[PDB]
Amino acid sequence: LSNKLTLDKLDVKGKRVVMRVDFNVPMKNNQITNNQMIKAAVPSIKFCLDNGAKSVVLMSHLGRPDGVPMPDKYSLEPVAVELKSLLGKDVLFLKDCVGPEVEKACANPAAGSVILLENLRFHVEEEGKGKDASGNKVKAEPAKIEAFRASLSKLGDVYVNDAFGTAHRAHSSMVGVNLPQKAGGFLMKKELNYFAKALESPERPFLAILGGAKVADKIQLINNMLDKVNEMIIGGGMAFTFLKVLNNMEIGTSLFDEEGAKIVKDLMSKAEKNGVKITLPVDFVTADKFDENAKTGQATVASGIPAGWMGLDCGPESSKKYAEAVTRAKQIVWNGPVGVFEWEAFARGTKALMDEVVKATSRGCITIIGGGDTATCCAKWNTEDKVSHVSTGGGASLELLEGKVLPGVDALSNI
Template identity: 35%
Template sequence: MKKIKTIDDFNFENQTALIRVDFNVPVNKFFEITDDTRIRYSIPTIKKIFSDKGKIVLISHFKRPKGIFRKEHSIKFLSDHLSKKLKISVNFCEVCVGKTVIEKVNALKPGEILLLENLRFYKEEEKEDHNFAYELSKLGNIYVNDAFGVVHRKHASITILPKFFKQKKCIGFLMKKEIQYLNQFLHGKGKKPITVLLGGAKISSKIEIIENFIKFADSILIGGGMSYPIVKIKGGRVGDSMIEKNQKFEKILKKILYKYQNIIHLPDDVIVADSFKNEANTKIVSIYSIPDGWMGLDIGPSSIKNFCKIIKKSGSIFWNGPVGVFEFSNFSLGTKSMAKAIANATEKGAFSLVGGGDSLASLKMGNYEKKISYLSTGGGSMLYYLNNKTLPGIEAIIS
């Protein structure tokens, strides 16, 4: 890959930085932010530009309004939160393109910042519309992409907008850190032993990650719905547990299991239920002998002990995906135990990287999120990158 320009390659004095951020943060029914990680991680980029005496225009999406203005999808509420974080007044503009926003941008002084309305109020954003991107390009001198969470999307502000800036485009510090830490795992450069913990429902989205990591990881722990297709391939009985059927990845899995069976660790016991609900009847059984009419919804006590033992000895840990249906309190112990084990290992010197909404949510359940080395701000984009796929947003910066 060509060298990616970062904001360290530019002096922003008297320049207007058009920064694509990802402020699609989770909120409660009162529009209170429940996790501002993406905002906090964008602050160093903003502060660097201010230290250069530059001006800033922020553009972001929020939720999925699908080109329709909806009050509940407005990002105006973010200006107050940003003002508190930056300790300066953050101005807001109700539109993203046109005469009004151009006038507001032209009125900016060094050290001032303007947040624009939700990009996805414009249907052109998700359609990679060139005219929309051109209108956005009038709002800055230097384009900065600091929105790792959406760099896998082919949207106007991600892939088309940078083209209008020629060589005056770069990534921010958030993006730089994401790439740096993900590369550390992708190329096996982390402190040994390297442990990879994968969970969640679908194995198809992570089969290439397993293929990439298996070459250098010391242990790959697999739990959640991902584990049952593997158990079935190995001849086990999985009852009514969730099985994602795909002949292509089944062939790949068979090859991996044959060659690297000592590296891949599955749960040996699971908590099964007779229905998919929190109040279901439960029992603990071998993962290879789940009775018909029962489904695995969490890893069992023996599996928790084995997984935690491996995590405790790790030098580097990557985690994506819960090992059970953690939304149900009766099936959340496995995932909570993983979060605690990773936090404890980190405190004792391991490097940990956790990504994916469910994994981050489980960390917050136990207040462990601040004990992790790095929380990835991307879910789909992180998996995309670790699958060795070119991210459109990064390609647009280096082309």
């Protein structure tokens, strides 16, 4: 991860820059409800402009068109408008992202042109698959995927990828742009710096906080983290599988991963061999059903959860034990809330934990927040600036934590 060319080292003078960005912003009726994702890209674009780029060609996706043109539903046009404001400068919107018209527009544009192409996932060749009118799955054609990729490549002299949250997929805009320099943008650079350090040479003690719902789909996540951490909190729905298996806890109607249950002792076994201290919750906020407005109660590992009730958050004693581990940590990676954060009644455990993680940052702890749900919590409670790094990609950060090679990152130029 440390070895990749980045925009700041990329000579852009006189050069057409084709830049993959993440402009998948929240929307209601083709009006942008939060422009944060667009503003995050501005530094990369403005850098190209300020250093004499002939053009910047922006490409991205939005919504779920699924390989079909939906310009009434998932057009990037509104985003071109918003971008005009943010840059203080015209953005040319083109109605497609490939083909002879688009290539002609991009071939030798007026010096300093900013161009936004239309949604990449209007074409089946981006993701390599999609759906038709009736919702039947359809596959893309190999020769067409090739031509789509060659068309994207014509649009610039150099390539910048600043869409970390898509770099876990081998999509055409991630891996298909064949130019002699392919560099990470300023957002990508951040992602690579933080996760490279945490995976290759973290501060010690290194704590991982892993939350979620099921166990069986995080074996490799847990396995790879146990190769590298000094401590690991387990929370969220996951924990009840560990507790039933390890302590014969009665869990009522709480999530139970029947498959995951059978490898729990194997995971602890590995932790023991490596000297990883595992901190599991010891008490819970319970709900009579999986509903935002369910009746609430309280339970401990000792009491167990009564029949017909489920544990949707940790309780105050668990919060302390989590806090003891956070206090010891010099580096933290947090991927996954420890309760049903979406519903206020079961968000306290995650909010409290978030406060401890903020306080740790103040004292010099390195704190990395995974994308997806953990980063939503940071947005929702105004702590994006109070941790060291909030990741911009859920699936992407998770695959890095699993120890995988990300196609989009791997395709970047070295040194």
